[PDB]
């Protein structure tokens, strides 16, 4: 990865994102989300990420 003063920013669009497979993994120490419930991340279609 990069440093904190040169953080990489990338765009995600025109793709089929699967969040259930990302969420169910226990390798993530902390996963806290604001404004959207993670369980309901699979029924929402967005504009840009």
């Amino acid at each position: 990865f990069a440093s904190v003063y040169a953080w990489n920013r990338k765009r995600i669009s025109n793709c089929v994102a699967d969040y259930s497979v990302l969420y169910n993994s226990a390798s993530f120490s902390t996963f806290k989300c604001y404004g959207v419930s993670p369980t309901k991340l699979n029924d929402l279609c967005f504009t840009n990420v």
């Binding site: 404004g35 959207v36 419930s37 309901k40 029924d43 929402l44």
Partner: protein
Amino acid sequence: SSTASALGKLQDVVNQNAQALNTLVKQLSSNFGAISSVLNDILSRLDPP
């Protein structure tokens, strides 16, 4: 038949009623400090607490 503006009272009453109803309907679309003005979105995006 010719001269207009002789029926100000009735038109004024109708205008008052229509304007009150219109502003009542328009008040529905305000945000009131929440995150969205439509209830179907907020129910389908957040968690009950």
